[model samples]
Target chain A: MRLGRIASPDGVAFVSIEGDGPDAVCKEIAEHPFGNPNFTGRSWPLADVRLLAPILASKVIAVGKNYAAHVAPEDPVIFLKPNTAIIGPNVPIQLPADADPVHHEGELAIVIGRPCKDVPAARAAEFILGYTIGNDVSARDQQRKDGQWMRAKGHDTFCPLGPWIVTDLDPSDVELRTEVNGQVRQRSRTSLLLHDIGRLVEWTSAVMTLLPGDVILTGTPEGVGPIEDGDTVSITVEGIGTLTNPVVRK
Target chain B: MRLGRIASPDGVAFVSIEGDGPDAVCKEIPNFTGRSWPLADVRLLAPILASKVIAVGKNYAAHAEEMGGVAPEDPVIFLKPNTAIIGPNVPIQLPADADPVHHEGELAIVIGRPCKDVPAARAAEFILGYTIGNDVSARDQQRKDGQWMRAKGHDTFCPLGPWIVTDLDPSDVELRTEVNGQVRQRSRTSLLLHDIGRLVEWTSAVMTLLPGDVILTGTPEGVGPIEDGDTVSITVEGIGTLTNPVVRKGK
Candidate 1:
């Protein structure tokens, strides 16, 4: 099932996608939640919809350079992005003044649906409800200067995930790639994660609590670079779906 | 009005402190409709009953630092005793972990009512309210590599205005202290601080937001060393009141 939240006249509502097509997801959410099903009959077009960050929790625990390609060889990095940086699908990615060289890092977003802690690697699947696409926007310059990533990676509009959440799909096989303005800037498969999804769940829960609706972003691959204004960035996983967003100058 | 959030049986409710004595200026918010009020219905406690840091923010419009004292070069440098920490009066002055440390240089707390980007100059009024109190803490090993403080002149325990959100006090003032019940660490309020209240408002607003439930910490003047197992502390103007009851580690 493809799960997503759409903007309604009332506010944003969570729903399941009913059809398949570029516009099918949008149409179904609009029709089911706002049109006939919604008694008030006040419906907002999906094109005019605004997305809020898909999932946030008491903590957004992310792995440090877990991918061997991005590892510094010095240490295992662990950082946090404040809850404010999350935005919805198709949302305009604002390039903060400090991060003039902001880059697009396409990642497979794992959405946790249940409360879990200290689960073994073999039991990691029990905690995952589904998956989505994420663009972990980064500020390469500031990240180098500040040993800590809170100020750099925590910029508003940094992480964009949505379109919808896919509940059925084998995590081992997924073609994840980033396209800037139709040009493929970086490409890789999920097979490259230094610490796979299951291990990540096991390790992260050891330090902090992983609650329902929390998202764990398995690290992004190498080849990350800048995205200019007006550029449309798309991230797609084989069976999951694609998440596209535009870049805007803030 | 000094606004703060309190955790009670009914969850979290917004409460503002109102007047003179222990009960002075403190009042509960009936049904606040703003994002600032997340949970409700509980006795108002200090925003940070115990916190890793009462982290303050810096400038808004311009890339500048607030008073160097509070929003120091590194997330502000005031450390107060968990002991001296208080909710409402309850006699702040108590024993200490070490020999009597003195009162802080200034007294004041920054209250954030909204989650907007504010600059330093506008921070003073942006404060939802104010309070008064002292910074009671120890300075042992503070100047050493792993000690509490380790500089030419560094003190432990950053107290605050006990009176929450009353009114604005001087940006600069003096520290009047009494030891063992006699006059001890006293100095002018203008010793430290690079950013004032406004900058603090802007810096802090950058993240999640000001739950508006915070009390400020006041750094001491010519902070001196104190001995362990002794009892002594102080409070400043407009900061949260402080009281420390000494306790020793068990064998």
Candidate 2:
């Protein structure tokens, strides 16, 4: 099932898409959960809606150098970004004065619905809430100099989550490609992961608690570069849908 | 007026210290605005109540070293402990497990009343609270190993913070000494600080937070070495208190 959340005449509503139409998700949520008696008879266009980060308490745990091609000589770089960085697609990426170079790393994102800890890879799927697309935006210069990248990776709009989170998709054979202004910059398959979905859950939970609504970016492939103003970025996964966003400087 | 929180007949309450009779501060909190209402008539005991860690977040502008004192180190070091590792009146000694010890240079501890962080000089007045203390701990071993002392410093019998705070005190009085009990280790005051009240406000503002019933410890003078279980002491002028205690390893 493809689940989404969109803004309505009343407020933000949870939605589920059932067909090929673009506005099915928003129409259902308003009719089912937020109508007058609880069902609004009104219909709205997709452009009128605003997007919130798909989940709250987004405990994002990203992997460092999961691909052999981009590994640096440093320690396995493990860190987290708070949910404050999330913004919807096409929402302008705000550039703080301190930031100089910003880059995007497109990777497969896993969403955990069940709370878990010290979970073995064999039983990892029991904790999965669903899966979605993630664009990991970073300030390249500050990250190299600051020793700690919390400020650089934590700027608002540093993360762009999806249009929908598709449940019931297979774990393998997913291909992700990123384009900057229609130029292909990154291409990789989930099959090349050094630490697969199951192992990531096992290792991270050993140190930090993994709560529901938590996000894990399972490392991006090589070919990471910079994105500038007036650029439109798109990420497409094999079975899952494509999530696109336009870039702008603030 | 010294403001504090303590265990009472109804669990916990905030109070102002009325007299040196010990129960004075507990009595004053019952009628205060932020005090827990159920603690209105509770009489409490002295000294044994749990005193929390005097916590601070981003106070020092620049630490002398990093990664065991190496690299282009820029992150600030944050250390916290309750009344643990303190000997208010006894000589502040070093633990056996710790090596490569040194005295840290800092002072100007003002009691704060509200949750918001403010300047150090301003912190002196808002405090219906005041106490003189030293943050004593092992450094070299801490940087090399996973932070264990940070937690063990909380083992029930570690701290000595039953010290009640007072308003209007000249924070710069030079009252500190380190002795192997017989020989002096080192002594100093608050003249050498990278940032004083301005630093305090900056730290408090880092989190811009406060605990309902809690205490915060100020950093100590040059930390020195002593044999296991040796006595370490501290004295503050006009603060009128002494905390002396021995260290012991837990089973």
Candidate 3:
């Protein structure tokens, strides 16, 4: 099932998306699409509405590269990107003047369905609302200097999520890619994960409570590269859709 | 002028406050339902519900070396989620997963307007006021995580308030902290390696500071471990005291 939010003449709403591209139809749901959505009986063609970042999350928790942590040295390096960094498709990724050479890291993103604490392994599937795509945009230079990913990846409009979130698909095996100006920059398979989804949820929940609208950016694949001003970056995950945004210097 | 939020019988509203002690009076402003509350009557929430708490790390020369550094061209910076913040008199719940959490007392800056790439000269216009803050941390997880998020990002880890003094001079205020009635940290803001001016200039240079956003000006030297059942009180020279009792949450 494809779920997303949109801004239309009827005002902002959660929608059950049908079809694809401009040929899509959005049935306006009464409130949050989190539970069984109650449609308002109004539908709009995708052409007249603006799609928003699917999840209105409070926090965007993420796992990063191995060298990013200690504590037995093998625990997944989990961190946070400010909620301020979230933006939807077509939004501009403004490159800060202080950070030279910002990079785009397209990776798998998970949307938590409910408040969970200390999740057990077998119940991991129940914890997820669905899956969305994310662009883990970063300021590479500041990332190395700050010794923390917060400010580097915390820039406004840094994390672009969704064309829409898909719940019916299997997230375990999927192809991920990052393309700039239509040129492929990153490519990999989600099957290559060192620690899979089940283990990740169990470990992450042990650290902090996960809220319903919270999101998780699974680590990115290799081939990450710079994104210059005036460039358009697109992140695509097989079965989900493409999330594209333009880049501008601010 | 001091302005703060309070949970009143009518509802939560912003009140420009008066008086310095228990007699402090709050007259509700246009930003809320007009009313009045004696400071002793209502519970004060965090001075501001910050969108994000952007903090400076290792910015005091004394504390810089205390954390194993002397100086660098760039001041260390980090962010604490709004979820981590607690208000005056609220208990700082110690995480059962973490051990020997420490207290870092510092001057906290509340941003009044949205700003980015601001010059030091124009920094004052963007500041809303000043408040007191405790940058609580888990010593064990801090060293082990190699990143401070989990160590410092836990719930109740960032306790702010008492209230915000919009007219206070942040450049030379005295900041002190007492744990279990014992003075653990006492320092003047004049000794900060990166003054509030430079912090706003530097922090805003990288990302936008939205209205109600907070900038913790880093802690002074003399930081040490805090424990369960201990009471921690942090006070700025002008802003009253922000005291929170520490309690260990059992797993």
Best by lDDT: 3
Error of 1 at B23 (Å): 7.2
Docking class of 3: medium
By DockQ thresholds, what CAPRI class is model 1?
Answer: incorrect
Best by DockQ: 3
Ranking by lDDT: 3, 1, 2
In angstroms, how far off is B192's CA in candidate 2?
10
Per-residue lDDT of candidate 2, residues A169-228 (tens digit): 775768888888888889988877777888878766643457676788887889888877
lDDT of 2 by residue, B105-224 (tens): 223243344445466667544544445444454555445433323322322223343345454344345455444444242332333232344444534443222322223333433445
Which parts of model 3 have CA positions greater than 4 angstroms off?
A66-73, B9-11, B31-34, B63-72
TM-score of chain A, model 2?
A: 0.86
> Judged by TM-score, which candidate is best?
3
* Tens digits of per-residue lDDT for model 3, B18-93: 8878887888883656578997888899888997888877766554234334454678788877788999889998
Fraction of native A-B contacts kept, per candidate: 0.05, 0.00, 0.39
Scored on chain A only, each candidate's TM-score is 0.84, 0.86, 0.95
lDDT of 1: 0.54
Model 3, global lDDT: 0.85
Name the Cα RMSD for model 2: 9.5
